[PDB]
Design an enzyme around this catalytic site. Structure first.
Site, PDB file in Angstrom:
ATOM      1  N   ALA A  47       0.816  -1.209   0.000  1.00 45.25           N
ATOM      2  CA  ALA A  47       0.000   0.000   0.000  1.00 45.25           C
ATOM      3  C   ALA A  47       0.850   1.261   0.000  1.00 45.25           C
ATOM      4  O   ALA A  47       0.609   2.176  -0.790  1.00 45.25           O
ATOM      5  CB  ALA A  47      -0.917   0.015   1.211  1.00 45.25           C
TER       6      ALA A  47
ATOM      7  N   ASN B 144      -5.336  14.134  15.853  1.00 43.66           N
ATOM      8  CA  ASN B 144      -4.462  13.127  16.460  1.00 43.66           C
ATOM      9  C   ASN B 144      -3.680  13.682  17.655  1.00 43.66           C
ATOM     10  O   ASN B 144      -3.605  13.046  18.709  1.00 43.66           O
ATOM     11  CB  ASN B 144      -3.491  12.574  15.404  1.00 43.66           C
ATOM     12  CG  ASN B 144      -2.422  11.650  15.975  1.00 43.66           C
ATOM     13  OD1 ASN B 144      -1.396  12.102  16.484  1.00 43.66           O
ATOM     14  ND2 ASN B 144      -2.640  10.349  15.866  1.00 43.66           N
TER      15      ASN B 144
ATOM     16  N   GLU C 162     -30.692  14.518   9.752  1.00 42.51           N
ATOM     17  CA  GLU C 162     -30.851  15.759  10.500  1.00 42.51           C
ATOM     18  C   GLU C 162     -29.488  16.364  10.785  1.00 42.51           C
ATOM     19  O   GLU C 162     -29.337  17.586  10.827  1.00 42.51           O
ATOM     20  CB  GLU C 162     -31.575  15.501  11.822  1.00 42.51           C
ATOM     21  CG  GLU C 162     -33.043  15.149  11.680  1.00 42.51           C
ATOM     22  CD  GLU C 162     -33.691  14.864  13.019  1.00 42.51           C
ATOM     23  OE1 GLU C 162     -33.312  15.511  14.013  1.00 42.51           O
ATOM     24  OE2 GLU C 162     -34.583  13.994  13.082  1.00 42.51           O
TER      25      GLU C 162
HETATM   26  N1  GTP Z   1      -4.802   7.726  17.155  1.00 42.19           N
HETATM   27  C1  GTP Z   1      -4.126   6.935  16.372  1.00 42.19           C
HETATM   28  N2  GTP Z   1      -3.398   7.433  15.373  1.00 42.19           N
HETATM   29  C2  GTP Z   1      -2.747   6.466  14.648  1.00 42.19           C
HETATM   30  C3  GTP Z   1      -2.767   5.083  14.855  1.00 42.19           C
HETATM   31  N3  GTP Z   1      -1.988   4.434  13.931  1.00 42.19           N
HETATM   32  C4  GTP Z   1      -1.498   5.389  13.188  1.00 42.19           C
HETATM   33  N4  GTP Z   1      -1.922   6.642  13.559  1.00 42.19           N
HETATM   34  C5  GTP Z   1      -1.556   7.924  12.930  1.00 42.19           C
HETATM   35  O1  GTP Z   1      -2.001   7.890  11.566  1.00 42.19           O
HETATM   36  C6  GTP Z   1      -0.892   8.198  10.682  1.00 42.19           C
HETATM   37  C7  GTP Z   1      -0.272   6.944  10.161  1.00 42.19           C
HETATM   38  O2  GTP Z   1      -0.836   6.412   8.975  1.00 42.19           O
HETATM   39  P1  GTP Z   1      -0.089   5.037   8.469  1.00 42.19           P
HETATM   40  O3  GTP Z   1      -0.171   3.981   9.496  1.00 42.19           O
HETATM   41  O4  GTP Z   1       1.288   5.432   8.052  1.00 42.19           O
HETATM   42  O5  GTP Z   1      -0.858   4.665   7.207  1.00 42.19           O
HETATM   43  P2  GTP Z   1      -2.263   4.147   6.893  1.00 42.19           P
HETATM   44  O6  GTP Z   1      -3.105   5.413   6.868  1.00 42.19           O
HETATM   45  O7  GTP Z   1      -2.678   3.054   7.761  1.00 42.19           O
HETATM   46  O8  GTP Z   1      -2.182   3.647   5.324  1.00 42.19           O
HETATM   47  P3  GTP Z   1      -0.799   3.317   4.471  1.00 42.19           P
HETATM   48  O9  GTP Z   1       0.061   4.565   4.301  1.00 42.19           O
HETATM   49  O10 GTP Z   1      -1.064   2.854   3.033  1.00 42.19           O
HETATM   50  O11 GTP Z   1      -0.116   2.254   5.308  1.00 42.19           O
HETATM   51  C8  GTP Z   1       0.130   8.916  11.536  1.00 42.19           C
HETATM   52  O12 GTP Z   1      -0.155  10.296  11.563  1.00 42.19           O
HETATM   53  C9  GTP Z   1      -0.052   8.235  12.883  1.00 42.19           C
HETATM   54  O13 GTP Z   1       0.352   9.127  13.926  1.00 42.19           O
HETATM   55  C10 GTP Z   1      -3.528   4.582  15.911  1.00 42.19           C
HETATM   56  O14 GTP Z   1      -3.661   3.401  16.219  1.00 42.19           O
HETATM   57  N5  GTP Z   1      -4.201   5.586  16.642  1.00 42.19           N
END
Ligand code: GTP
Ligand code: TA1
Ligand code: ANP
Ligand code: GDP
Ligand code: MG
Lengths: 426, 412, 300
Positions: free
Chosen positions: B72, B179, B227
């Site tokens: 991906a 986040n 709504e």
């Molecule tokens: N709150 C929270 N944020 C998360 C978590 N896992 C990842 N993130 C945040 O989401 C982003 C990471 O996205 P990735 O895991 O790199 O990618 P993905 O959106 O799953 O998709 P791919 O890039 O194709 O792997 C970063 O900004 C992380 O800080 C989680 O379990 N909880």
């Protein structure tokens, strides 16, 4: 996410023998034994480097190509030498001379055809292949020459896949080869024109690390190569298992290579300490960053202070707080902002694996693409032109079938990269 | 009546499982019990397999678990052009079967992360087909906003900006959560130095449970999904409202518990507790939905809302005489037996769209332009099958949003 | 510096398009050098150098644009003419044309051979399919061919192991093109005609390019691979603009990015003058593709 591993030349062969001597414990597989791993999570990802055969016998999908039968044979009669299948043994009992042209045009091309058949078979195994890992020398005949042609053909066959090359550059302080710069400039040419990712490992760099950080009074090649084989695990195996934040070659390349010029990354290791004397177990969070971002912990001669970080990859492995890792990264990017690039908001793409390196609690693999590598290029090029001006060892290549213009072209593309690197350095 | 959820991307799957864990928890359903109306979609095989080995392994059907065996990566281009168009048809197929399974569905509950690969590209093309084949349905997505300073990826803005570019003309309403803001809540309110990703998902899921789950239950003043958009987005744009939860007290240190309606409502107008980094710098409230779940008195709510309206500090839009949606549920706010929530008998969920969103977007907008000036890792997108037009035109398109809020808001 | 001459041409409206719909020309022809853009509305101005309407014939395109090249061949300087533009805009029609009205390429030969004290000319015609160079002069149809570009001490790139042919008359070269069209493959092949005249010596090499168009409607990675080639081409041209402007700007160009930009290095930045041919479509639905080519060409 399967990948093929290819060993090219004496250097590649020697390192490969060490790599498969380390990763074997990482996956938990004996020479000709089955899954003897401690955990069972390692089994779910053995298809990345192993081919399902007799169930018990897990055959590593590695292609070893060497021009020196004796060198390849010493591996076969060693520790993890019988683990490989004879079908993947590509030995060329021809003129095994340390010469790029000789190992590329003369005795190279003839063996390449045989190699292609094996590699094409390894790629067309099962599922979907991701890329091709390669290990070679820069100042050799088989490593720099044959390996260069191997990658050229591979990228031609599968342009949809990525290539990760691990190359030991010519030792600047004490060159191990006389025609080293001559082979280096030629090998680096096809490298930048073919592979997508490349890690540079310096000879004396490993020596210094095994002298200051590690207390090894006798750092033989088996000791140096061992360390190298530990960094590649973090880039490959460590990025195959699950974690709090997964990453891979695609994730890495897209967050490391800012332009279509390949770019050379410098590797490092976070848990680098002695056996019992340095057993402080100081591996929380800041201690790792202090180790990874150390100007004397890089596996390259070029220090991070002699340039700016273009893009940094943080491949952590083990149980830890995501917030603690990222928080510490911000600290580093703020404290060393002067050389952390000012044209990119966040240069460090964090990643945290959920599995440590067996007998290690906290670990992290350092991958940093900095403009500091520019010093290395200029160093190699300097040595090249110094002898190229006299053409002292030119006849050794001309007799094989090397164009005069070819030599100058290899340098002109190499210098090109040096010039562009500086554009992004300012 | 029913709603189908679509979790796309690593974070989408993670938050989805954590959210649904809470969903069945309050429902009183054990791991081996009904059939959930949600699907997991990710190109990363290792992420989807987490639900096939972790919790609720036998709760979800394999049909609701789309899994790619390729790579991906973290590039919008890959999940939109390269490999995106390889699994999309299968995804659409499953969600279509589910749509037909339910008699008279309301809409879809999208879950994804703006900063990612599968959470960006995949979502974009998915919503594209949804607005064309299900235009008569409500498209409500829960977009996870990347941290303003603590970015996870380098190409963070590159993926996020493009996702919102196309989804802006697809989704009716997109609930954005910050986040980094979740970390702030866990630090200041929850009082913890160990806010794991799974810990963040606990808070977001708590919101969703009150936005859909409990609101789908017969209360005193139910608010339909239709709504929502009708009283949240006064314009045909995919505006992004904030998600605020009143009860953020940790079940350990602070122990007030018994809190009056006036206090809980007042706890949703403070920048310290908004689950978003869109601080009330100069943002005017245009539409605010207040979902009260638990032991709450309608008159108490009316009084709390009235006193806030006359506070003046909370400036509403000039053309907004009344922008308060009153939601009253009879189901109390459930809490994870092993989480970090104190568990109150009443919770207030505030979801409003303010002009502060422009400030947050401007930060990410600038982040895109910064790297775009030199193109950066543009080749990792162009080589996937994307032209400069997919960046330059998007840059201008997204820039119109900064002007949108600037006109909808601020002006008297 | 010299400036890459810029030329724009729009496709004419036939009874077919008129029957299908209005196909109103969004692009208006303002002056011989500029254009006024009103696309159903969007306003833009194209400042190219030369622009011809849908009225002019195929020979007309060559008459003005290609004629200046024919003179340069005699000068001894190399010239490269590349046809760029949206899909099905008529680029192949403008470059090749028909027997009655020959395009810039066939007509170029007619005039150059007519212009050609002994003179000699080498002819080369090949198609680049999937970044692969296939010779149209010798082989029958679609094997890997063994040729690379080497860089001489001069810094000029040279393609090695190319086919060369001697031709007496223009029809001989035209005949070779007929063979090339017959052996030609297409995308879901770049046709580059090279003509090198020897003035007797001073040698001038000309090359014609006509981008085939693969647009996806709703091989291996053919889309993504070329997408990258067009991307680097756009970025390279941009760098060429700023560096040619000459305030003081030394920018390194991403020529190494793609094989395409690498091979045409000598034509753009090296020994040789090039012309930019932008063929566009008046259709409103095609405006998507036009928007990119418009911005790329004219600076808005
Ligand atoms: N709150 C929270 N944020 C998360 C978590 N896992 C990842 N993130 C945040 O989401 C982003 C990471 O996205 P990735 O895991 O790199 O990618 P993905 O959106 O799953 O998709 P791919 O890039 O194709 O792997 C970063 O900004 C992380 O800080 C989680 O379990 N909880
Ligand atoms: C009792 C105890 O805890 O011993 C440790 C140990 O003392 C130390 C010093 C180890 C030790 O490593 C070295 O001395 C070393 C020797 C040559 C080259 C490089 C390093 C160790 O040998 C290495 C070994 O590493 C592993 O087990 C990892 O899984 C590692 N494995 C290998 O490198 C390996 C070695 C032999 C055979 C097969 C594999 C690994 C690292 C990254 C990716 C994959 C695997 C460990 C923790 C130790 C010993 C055994 C003493 C250290 O190294 C590593 C790579 O962990 C050196 O500094 C660290 C800190 C460790 O605490
Ligand atoms: N001036 C013109 N007069 C008559 N027919 C024309 C003219 N220009 C183009 N055409 C026709 O319109 C189509 C476009 O032709 P060409 O085939 O010229 O397109 P491109 O070459 O524009 N297409 P593409 O290569 O697929 O990217 C063909 O059927 C041409 O014969
Ligand atoms: N780290 C490392 N370097 C090696 C090893 N073997 C040779 N080298 C290096 O490789 C260079 C010599 O090339 P070599 O491998 O003999 O070339 P080839 O065998 O002809 O392909 C020197 O710079 C050596 O330091 C090794 O096992 N480990
Ligand atoms: Mg993922």
């Amino acid at each position: 996410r399967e990948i093929v591993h290819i060993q090219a030349g004496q250097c590649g062969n020697q390192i490969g023998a060490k790599f498969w001597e380390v990763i074997s414990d990482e996956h938990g597989i004996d020479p000709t034994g089955s899954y003897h791993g401690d955990s069972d999570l390692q089994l779910e990802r053995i298809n990345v480097y192993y081919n399902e055969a007799a169930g018990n016998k897990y055959v590593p999908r590695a292609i070893l190509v060497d021009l020196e039968p004796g060198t390849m044979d010493s591996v076969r009669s060693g520790p993890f030498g019988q683990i490989f299948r004879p079908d993947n043994f590509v030995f060329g009992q021809s003129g095994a001379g340390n010469n790029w042209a000789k190992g590329h045009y003369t005795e190279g091309a003839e063996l390449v055809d045989s190699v292609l058949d094996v590699v094409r078979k390894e790629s067309e195994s099962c599922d979907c292949l991701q890329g091709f890992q390669l290990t070679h020398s820069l100042g050799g005949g088989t490593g720099s020459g044959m390996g260069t042609l191997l990658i050229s053909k591979i990228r031609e066959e599968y342009p949809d896949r990525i290539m990760n090359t691990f190359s030991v550059v010519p030792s600047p302080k004490v060159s191990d080869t006389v025609v080293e710069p001559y082979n280096a400039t030629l090998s680096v040419h096809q490298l930048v024109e073919n592979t997508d990712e490349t890690y540079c490992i310096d000879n004396e760099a490993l020596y210094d690390i095994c002298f200051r950080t590690l207390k090894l009074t006798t750092p033989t090649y088996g000791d140096l190569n061992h360390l190298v084989s530990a960094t590649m695990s973090g880039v490959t195996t460590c990025l195959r298992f699950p974690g709090q934040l997964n990453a891979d070659l695609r994730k890495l390349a897209v967050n490391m290579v800012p332009f279509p010029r390949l770019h050379f990354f410098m590797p490092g290791f976070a848990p680098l300490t002695s056996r019992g004397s340095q057993q402080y177990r100081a591996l929380t969070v800041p201690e790792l960053t202090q180790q990874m971002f150390d100007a004397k912990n890089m596996m390259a001669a070029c220090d991070p202070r002699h340039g700016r970080y273009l893009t940094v990859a943080a491949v952590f492995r083990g149980r830890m707080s995501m917030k603690e890792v990222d928080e510490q990264m911000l600290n580093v990017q703020n404290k060393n902002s002067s050389y952390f690039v000012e044209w990119i908001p966040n240069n460090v793409k964090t990643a945290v694996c959920d599995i440590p390196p067996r007998g290690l609690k906290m670990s992290a693999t350092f991958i940093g693409n900095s403009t500091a590598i520019q010093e290395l290029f200029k160093r190699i090029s300097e040595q090249f032109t110094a002898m190229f001006r006299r053409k002292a060892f030119l006849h050794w290549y001309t007799g094989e079938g090397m164009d005069e213009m070819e030599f100058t072209e290899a340098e002109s593309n190499m210098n090109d990269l040096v010039s562009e690197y500086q554009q992004y350095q300012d | 009546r029913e709603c189908i959820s679509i979790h796309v991307g690593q974070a989408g799957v993670q938050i989805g499982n954590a959210c649904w864990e809470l969903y069945c928890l309050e429902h009183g359903i054990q791991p081996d019990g009904h059939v959930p109306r949600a699907v997991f979609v990710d190109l990363e095989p290792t992420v989807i397999d987490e639900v096939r080995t972790g919790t609720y392994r036998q709760l979800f059907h394999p049909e609701q678990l789309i899994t790619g065996k390729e790579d991906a990566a973290n590039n919008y281009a890959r999940g939109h052009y390269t490999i995106g168009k390889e699994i999309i048809d299968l995804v659409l197929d499953r969600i279509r079967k589910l749509a037909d399974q339910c008699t008279g569905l309301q809409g879809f509950s999208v879950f994804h992360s703006f900063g990612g690969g599968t959470g960006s590209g995949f979502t974009s093309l998915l919503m594209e087909r949804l607005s064309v084949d299900y235009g008569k349905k409500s498209k409500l997505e829960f977009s996870i906003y990347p941290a303003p300073q603590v970015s996870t990826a380098v190409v963070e803005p590159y993926n996020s900006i493009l996702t919102t570019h196309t989804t802006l003309e697809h989704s009716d309403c997109a609930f954005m959560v910050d986040n980094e803001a979740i970390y702030d809540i866990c630090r200041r309110n929850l009082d913890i130095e160990r806010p794991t990703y799974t810990n963040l998902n606990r808070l977001i899921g708590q919101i969703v449970s009150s936005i859909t789950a409990s609101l789908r239950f017969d209360g005193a003043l139910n608010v339909d999904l239709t709504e929502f958009q009708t009283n949240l987005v006064p314009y045909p744009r995919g505006h992004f409202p904030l998600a605020t939860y009143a009860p953020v007290i940790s079940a350990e240190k602070a122990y007030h518990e018994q809190l009056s309606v006036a206090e809980i409502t007042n706890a949703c107008f403070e920048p310290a507790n908004q689950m978003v980094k869109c601080d009330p710098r100069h943002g005017k409230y245009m539409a605010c939905c207040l979902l009260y779940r638990g032991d709450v008195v309608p008159k108490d709510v009316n009084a709390a809302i009235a006193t806030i309206k006359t506070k003046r500090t909370i400036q509403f839009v000039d053309w907004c005489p009344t922008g308060f949606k009153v939601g009253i549920n009879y189901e109390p706010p459930t809490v994870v037996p092993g989480g970090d929530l104190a568990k109150v008998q009443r919770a207030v969920c505030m979801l409003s769209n303010t002009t502060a969103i422009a400030e947050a977007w401007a930060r990410l907008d600038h982040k895109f332009d910064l790297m775009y000036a030199k193109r950066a890792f543009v080749h990792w997108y162009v080589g996937e099958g994307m032209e400069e037009g997919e960046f330059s035109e998007a840059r201008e398109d997204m820039a119109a949003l900064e002007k949108d809020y600037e006109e909808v808001g601020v002006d008297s | 510096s010299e400036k890459v001459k810029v030329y724009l041409r729009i496709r004419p409206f036939l009874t077919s398009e008129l029957d299908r719909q209005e196909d109103q020309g969004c692009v208006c022809i303002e002056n011989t050098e500029t254009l006024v853009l009103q696309a159903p509305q969007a306003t833009h101005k194209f400042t190219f150098s030369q622009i011809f309407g849908p009225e002019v014939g195929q020979v007309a395109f060559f008459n003005l644009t290609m004629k200046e090249m024919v003179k340069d061949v005699l000068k001894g300087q190399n010239w490269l003419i590349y046809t760029y533009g949206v899909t099905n805009s008529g680029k192949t029609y403008t470059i090749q044309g028909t027997s009655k009205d020959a395009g810039i390429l066939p007509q170029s030969l007619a005039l150059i051979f007519n212009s050609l004290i002994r003179f000699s000319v080498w002819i080369s015609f090949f198609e680049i399919y999937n970044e692969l160079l296939y010779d149209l002069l010798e082989p029958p149809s679609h094997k890997r061919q063994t040729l690379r570009l080497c860089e001489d001490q001069n810094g000029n790139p040279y393609v090695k192991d190319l086919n060369w042919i001697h031709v007496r008359d223009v029809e001989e070269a035209w005949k070779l093109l007929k063979v090339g069209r017959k052996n030609q493959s297409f995308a879901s092949s770049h046709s580059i005609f090279s003509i090198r005249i020897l003035h007797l010596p001073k040698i001038s090499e000309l090359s014609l390019c006509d981008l085939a168009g693969s647009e996806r409607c709703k091989r291996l990675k053919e889309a993504g691979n070329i997408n990258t080639s067009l991307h680097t081409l756009g970025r390279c041209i941009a760098a060429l603009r700023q560096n040619q402007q000459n305030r003081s700007k030394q920018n390194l160009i991403p020529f190494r990015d793609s094989k395409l930009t690498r091979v045409f290095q000598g034509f753009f930045t090296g020994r040789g003058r090039s012309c930019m041919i932008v063929n566009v479509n008046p259709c409103a639905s095609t405006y998507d593709e036009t928007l990119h080519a418009a911005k790329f060409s004219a600076l808005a």
